[PDB]
């Protein structure tokens, strides 16, 4: 064995034994159980940040746990190849989307076998291939046929200079990014997932995820925003009909979640596209100028929680249902056309946006609600205004003395008898719209015929295959430019028509990657039953909380839908989610590495520090164990040279260790079996090795904080080096130690771990398993403790190292000499001395 620690040298060579042994390329062998852990692919930028190292380490380490412990772990390789990054460096560079990928993708996986993660790369897609995309394709045209998929018109941000869409991202005070022109709306068709039709499902099925972060639901259930309120129809007075038609004309319709504050209603708002708006200003100026400040505005819900809630009076009235008093009806800018019924009731004593907006207006507060105790006082707002649990209703006539859903339930059942209200469930959850303007995604699968219309592409004619030879120059899409593209034939009637032009929401490909993971060589279609079968759901999932809402509402989504169309037998995609912390490192006034002598890690200020030269400045160990060592998973990270330089020292310790304590004696058989008669510094040894590896185990498969378990090594270690190990078992109580340890640290370093193991053992680390706990080395040696009996040794006792004072109580009392001492007398008191006497009086 050499003296010295080479990372340079050994990891290629573990590299490629890992390789030709095969141990990561896995089958669906029904031998040995499953473990899917799944890592977020990435996008292939050009280069892996620190970042990608933690999570993909995290991921790794996890993985290479389960393999010790004898699991089939599938850890799956991707490129979310699709998206604007490539567009962009398409306009810069004059280059294809696709050759720039390409370029990157195969860099990157040099940078990501060089790290040593035990990874299945023949399991390896690539999002912007047709062979992977065409199944997207096919589902699109397979719930286009159920109505699952539909064609509507849609709002957009039209560039009138850029001549291009515009995402709101990209629109600034009402202008383009990089044309500052004024923005226009324009009304286009465009395609939509019906996800509203699964919300209840979405929903609900989260009570299924017992294993999830608890924030992490709650933010899905939050998007979703599912409320149960009333619907409630305010006729519409004598005097307040002009110039309304249909139902406008007798009735206004509301949504509300509080109708047991119905009684309290002072006034009521509606949208400024609402009829009984445009109606109320067809000879009021005043009234049109608002109309038009609201219809040029933002629906932003940051923009509207922010805004100032501004209202105009029209004139116009309506009838609560309940009390029957005639209430004006106003213009807001707060209500949204769209939402429910565009119109709203105003509570100002019970809600609180209604309650400044009524205090800025003078508009009249009606307390219809008592919390008890407290006082109401109209010109103060108190947080128990709005109380719904320990609220109780007054000035309701029927309805007072009831709670919020005792009122609920009645104030329906009042509605439907007159016929001016019924119970209604809303979500605050719109459509998908899927349709994006861009070039670099995933085709749609549509034909337009003037004669049989939006026409989906037969199964037998995808994938529509996105043309690589393109460079995009920003100005409105070029497949929109190419009629080589686009001019087609109709697949039902043959004669001339037209292929859709947009792409697909580059969501689309990660909400079902999971999946193609499982056999994504299959040709028949999206996933083969059988590997769907064996490897069900992912065991466990790795990525930020960024993506805790869109990503994971997408892909629960997508995994009911090819679950209903009988491609997978799972419920959800995700059994377990993991969200790692940001790496973050110093600014200075660019990448560090390029400066001579704190935020996030980004491409945004290239703050990212290359993971390659710290690789060939400390090798792949160094980087892995760094990143699982400064800081929790969870918790955020900070770049430290300092930091890497502990690391690799401590590799250099294990090594060293390891050397010397071969250069003194050879390898030996690893000490197992009875204890006794060990001595007592090498009985604590053993108890420190198997409290060790429990602690490791549990760090690892329970609260997957590795930093503590590397921690509960280096200890281990350090009573090691205080041991004297040079007798015959010593030697072998050594061997045991270090057999655990390099195990224990393996998925944190594979590289110098599997070097330093064949060194010390002849067998296979990953069948000699994960190290397990000898229960009989953690038991520790009896103690004898003595009895008294007023003060007077009456007998002895032999107790245990972890017996409780009431254990000594117990055993000193049933002492026989304590009995015959007693003369069958109580005590008044029994003093307890632990590891030395117990005394009875
Ligand atoms: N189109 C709309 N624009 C603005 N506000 C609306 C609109 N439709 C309904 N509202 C108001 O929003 C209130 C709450 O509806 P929402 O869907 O946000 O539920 P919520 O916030 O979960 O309910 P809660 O206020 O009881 O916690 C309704 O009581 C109603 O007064
Ligand atoms: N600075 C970082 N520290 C730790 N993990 C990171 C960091 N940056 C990205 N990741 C993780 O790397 C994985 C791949 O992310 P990716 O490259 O797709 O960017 P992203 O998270 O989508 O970024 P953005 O939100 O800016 O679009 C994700 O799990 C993400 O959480
Ligand atoms: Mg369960
Ligand atoms: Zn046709």
Request: net charge negative; proline share 5%; glycine share 8%.
């Given at each position: 064995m050499q003296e010295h620690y080479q990372p340079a040298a050994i990891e290629p060579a573990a590299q490629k034994k890992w390789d030709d042994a095969?141990?990561?390329?896995?089958?669906?062998?029904?031998?040995k159980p499953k473990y899917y852990c799944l890592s977020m692919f990435p996008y292939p930028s050009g280069k892996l940040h620190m970042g990608h190292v933690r999570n993909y380490t995290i991921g790794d380490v996890l993985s290479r746990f389960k393999l010790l412990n004898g699991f089939n772990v599938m850890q799956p390789m991707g490129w979310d190849?699709?998206?604007?990054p490539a567009e962009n460096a398409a306009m810069k560079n004059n280059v294809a989307p696709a050759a720039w990928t390409y370029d990157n993708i195969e860099y990157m996986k040099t940078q990501l076998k060089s790290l040593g993660f035990?990874?299945?790369?023949?399991?390896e897609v690539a999002t912007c291939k047709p062979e992977y995309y065409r199944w997207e394709q096919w589902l699109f045209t397979k719930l286009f046929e159920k109505g699952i998929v539909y064609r509507k018109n849609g709002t957009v941000n039209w560039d009138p200079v850029d001549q291009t869409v515009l995402a709101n991202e990209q629109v600034i005070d009402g202008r383009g990014w990089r044309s500052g022109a004024l923005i226009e709306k324009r009304e286009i068709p465009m395609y939509y997932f019906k996800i509203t039709d699964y919300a209840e499902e979405l929903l609900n099925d989260?009570?299924?995820?017992?294993?999830?972060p608890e924030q992490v639901k709650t933010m899905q259930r939050n998007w979703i925003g599912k409320s149960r309120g009333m619907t409630v129809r305010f006729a519409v007075s004598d005097?307040?009909?002009?110039?309304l038609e249909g139902d406008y004309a007798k009735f206004l319709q509301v949504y509300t979640t509080?109708?047991?504050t119905l009684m309290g209603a002072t006034y009521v708002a509606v949208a400024a596209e609402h009829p009984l708006a445009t109606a109320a200003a067809a000879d009021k100026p005043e009234l049109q100028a608002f109309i038009a400040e609201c219809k040029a505005g933002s629906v932003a819900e940051a923009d509207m929680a922010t805004m100032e809630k501004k209202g105009v009076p029209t004139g116009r009235y309506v009838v609560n249902?309940?009390?029957?008093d005639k209430l004006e009806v106003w213009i807001a800018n707060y209500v949204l056309w769209?939402?429910?019924?565009g119109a709203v009731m105003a509570v100002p004593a019970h809600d609180e946006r209604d309650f400044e907006f009524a205090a800025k207006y003078n508009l009249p507060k009606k307390q219809?609600?008592?919390?008890?105790?407290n006082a109401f006082d109209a010109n103060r707002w108190q947080?128990?205004?709005?109380?719904?649990?320990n609220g109780v209703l007054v000035?309701?006539?029927?309805?007072?003395?009831?709670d919020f859903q005792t009122a609920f339930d009645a104030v329906a059942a009042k509605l439907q008898s007159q016929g001016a209200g019924e119970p209604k469930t809303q979500y605050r959850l719109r459509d998908w719209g899927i349709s994006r303007?861009?070039?670099?995604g995933c085709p749609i699968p549509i034909v337009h015929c003037?004669?049989?219309?939006?026409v989906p592409v037969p199964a037998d004619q995808l994938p529509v295959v996105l043309p690589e030879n393109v460079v995009p120059?920003?100005?409105?899409?070029?497949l929109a430019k190419m009629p080589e593209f686009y001019e087609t034939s109709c697949?039902?009637?043959?004669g001339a028509a037209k292929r859709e032009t947009d792409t697909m929401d580059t969501f689309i490909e990660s909400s079902w990657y999971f999946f193609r993971?499982?056999?994504?060589?299959?040709?028949?279609?999206?996933?083969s039953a059988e590997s769907a079968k064996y490897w069900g759901a992912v065991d466990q999932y790795i990525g930020?909380?960024?993506?805790?809402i869109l990503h994971l509402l997408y892909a629960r989504f997508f995994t009911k839908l090819m679950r209903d169309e009988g491609l997978?037998?799972?419920?959800?995609?995700?059994?377990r989610l993991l969200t790692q912390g940001m790496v973050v490192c110093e600014t200075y006034?660019?990448?560090?590495?390029?400066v001579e002598l704190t935020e996030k890690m980004s491409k945004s200020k290239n703050n990212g520090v290359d993971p390659q030269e710290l690789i060939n400045a400390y090798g792949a160990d160094t980087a892995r164990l760094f990143m699982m060592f400064?800081?929790?998973?969870?918790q955020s990270l900070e770049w430290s040279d300092s930091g890497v330089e502990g690391a690799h020292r401590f590799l250099r310790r294990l090594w060293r260790t390891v050397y010397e304590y071969l250069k003194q004696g050879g390898a030996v058989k690893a000490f197992a079996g009875?204890?006794?008669?060990?001595?007592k510094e090498l009985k604590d040894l053993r108890h420190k090795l198997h409290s060790t590896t429990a602690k490791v185990s549990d760090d690892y498969?329970?609260?997957?904080?590795?930093n503590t378990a590397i921690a509960a090594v280096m200890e281990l270690l350090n009573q090691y080096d205080k041991?004297?190990?040079?007798?015959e078992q010593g030697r072998a109580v050594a061997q045991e130690v270090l057999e655990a340890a390099v195990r224990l640290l393996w998925p944190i370093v594979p590289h110098i771990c599997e070097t330093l193991w064949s060194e010390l053992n002849g067998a296979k680390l990953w069948e000699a398993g994960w190290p397990t706990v000898?229960?009989?080395?953690?038991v520790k040696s009896e103690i004898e403790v003595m009895v008294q009996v007023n003060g007077k040794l009456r007998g002895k006792i032999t107790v245990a190292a972890d017996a409780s004072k009431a254990d000594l109580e117990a055993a000193a009392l049933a002492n026989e000499g304590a009995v015959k001492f007693m003369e069958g007398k109580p005590a008044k008191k029994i003093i307890v001395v632990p590891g030395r006497l117990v005394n009875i009086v």
């Amino acid at each position: 064995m050499q003296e010295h620690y080479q990372p340079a040298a050994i990891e290629p060579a573990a590299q490629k034994k890992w390789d030709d042994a095969r141990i990561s390329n896995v089958s669906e062998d029904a031998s040995k159980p499953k473990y899917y852990c799944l890592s977020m692919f990435p996008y292939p930028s050009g280069k892996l940040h620190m970042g990608h190292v933690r999570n993909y380490t995290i991921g790794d380490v996890l993985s290479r746990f389960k393999l010790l412990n004898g699991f089939n772990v599938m850890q799956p390789m991707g490129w979310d190849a699709f998206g604007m990054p490539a567009e962009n460096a398409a306009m810069k560079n004059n280059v294809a989307p696709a050759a720039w990928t390409y370029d990157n993708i195969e860099y990157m996986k040099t940078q990501l076998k060089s790290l040593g993660f035990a990874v299945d790369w023949e399991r390896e897609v690539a999002t912007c291939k047709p062979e992977y995309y065409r199944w997207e394709q096919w589902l699109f045209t397979k719930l286009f046929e159920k109505g699952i998929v539909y064609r509507k018109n849609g709002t957009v941000n039209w560039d009138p200079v850029d001549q291009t869409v515009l995402a709101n991202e990209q629109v600034i005070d009402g202008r383009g990014w990089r044309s500052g022109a004024l923005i226009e709306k324009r009304e286009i068709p465009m395609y939509y997932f019906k996800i509203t039709d699964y919300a209840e499902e979405l929903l609900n099925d989260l009570d299924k995820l017992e294993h999830w972060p608890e924030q992490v639901k709650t933010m899905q259930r939050n998007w979703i925003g599912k409320s149960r309120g009333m619907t409630v129809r305010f006729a519409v007075s004598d005097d307040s009909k002009q110039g309304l038609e249909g139902d406008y004309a007798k009735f206004l319709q509301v949504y509300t979640t509080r109708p047991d504050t119905l009684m309290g209603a002072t006034y009521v708002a509606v949208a400024a596209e609402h009829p009984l708006a445009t109606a109320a200003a067809a000879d009021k100026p005043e009234l049109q100028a608002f109309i038009a400040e609201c219809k040029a505005g933002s629906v932003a819900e940051a923009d509207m929680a922010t805004m100032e809630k501004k209202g105009v009076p029209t004139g116009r009235y309506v009838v609560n249902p309940l009390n029957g008093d005639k209430l004006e009806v106003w213009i807001a800018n707060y209500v949204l056309w769209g939402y429910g019924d565009g119109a709203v009731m105003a509570v100002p004593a019970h809600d609180e946006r209604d309650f400044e907006f009524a205090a800025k207006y003078n508009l009249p507060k009606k307390q219809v609600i008592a919390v008890g105790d407290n006082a109401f006082d109209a010109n103060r707002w108190q947080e128990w205004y709005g109380d719904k649990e320990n609220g109780v209703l007054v000035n309701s006539g029927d309805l007072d003395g009831l709670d919020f859903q005792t009122a609920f339930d009645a104030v329906a059942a009042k509605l439907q008898s007159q016929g001016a209200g019924e119970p209604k469930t809303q979500y605050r959850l719109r459509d998908w719209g899927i349709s994006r303007q861009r070039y670099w995604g995933c085709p749609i699968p549509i034909v337009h015929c003037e004669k049989c219309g939006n026409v989906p592409v037969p199964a037998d004619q995808l994938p529509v295959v996105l043309p690589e030879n393109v460079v995009p120059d920003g100005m409105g899409s070029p497949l929109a430019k190419m009629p080589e593209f686009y001019e087609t034939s109709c697949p039902c009637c043959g004669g001339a028509a037209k292929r859709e032009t947009d792409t697909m929401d580059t969501f689309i490909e990660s909400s079902w990657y999971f999946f193609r993971y499982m056999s994504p060589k299959f040709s028949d279609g999206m996933v083969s039953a059988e590997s769907a079968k064996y490897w069900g759901a992912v065991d466990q999932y790795i990525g930020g909380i960024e993506h805790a809402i869109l990503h994971l509402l997408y892909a629960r989504f997508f995994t009911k839908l090819m679950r209903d169309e009988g491609l997978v037998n799972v419920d959800e995609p995700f059994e377990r989610l993991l969200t790692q912390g940001m790496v973050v490192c110093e600014t200075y006034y660019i990448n560090p590495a390029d400066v001579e002598l704190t935020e996030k890690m980004s491409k945004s200020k290239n703050n990212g520090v290359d993971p390659q030269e710290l690789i060939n400045a400390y090798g792949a160990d160094t980087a892995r164990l760094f990143m699982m060592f400064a800081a929790p998973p969870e918790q955020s990270l900070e770049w430290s040279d300092s930091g890497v330089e502990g690391a690799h020292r401590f590799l250099r310790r294990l090594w060293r260790t390891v050397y010397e304590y071969l250069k003194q004696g050879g390898a030996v058989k690893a000490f197992a079996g009875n204890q006794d008669g060990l001595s007592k510094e090498l009985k604590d040894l053993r108890h420190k090795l198997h409290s060790t590896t429990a602690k490791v185990s549990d760090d690892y498969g329970r609260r997957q904080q590795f930093n503590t378990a590397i921690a509960a090594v280096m200890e281990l270690l350090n009573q090691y080096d205080k041991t004297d190990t040079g007798s015959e078992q010593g030697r072998a109580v050594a061997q045991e130690v270090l057999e655990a340890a390099v195990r224990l640290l393996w998925p944190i370093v594979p590289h110098i771990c599997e070097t330093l193991w064949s060194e010390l053992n002849g067998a296979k680390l990953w069948e000699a398993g994960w190290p397990t706990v000898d229960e009989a080395a953690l038991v520790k040696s009896e103690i004898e403790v003595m009895v008294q009996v007023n003060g007077k040794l009456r007998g002895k006792i032999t107790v245990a190292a972890d017996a409780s004072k009431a254990d000594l109580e117990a055993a000193a009392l049933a002492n026989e000499g304590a009995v015959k001492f007693m003369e069958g007398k109580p005590a008044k008191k029994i003093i307890v001395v632990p590891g030395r006497l117990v005394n009875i009086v």
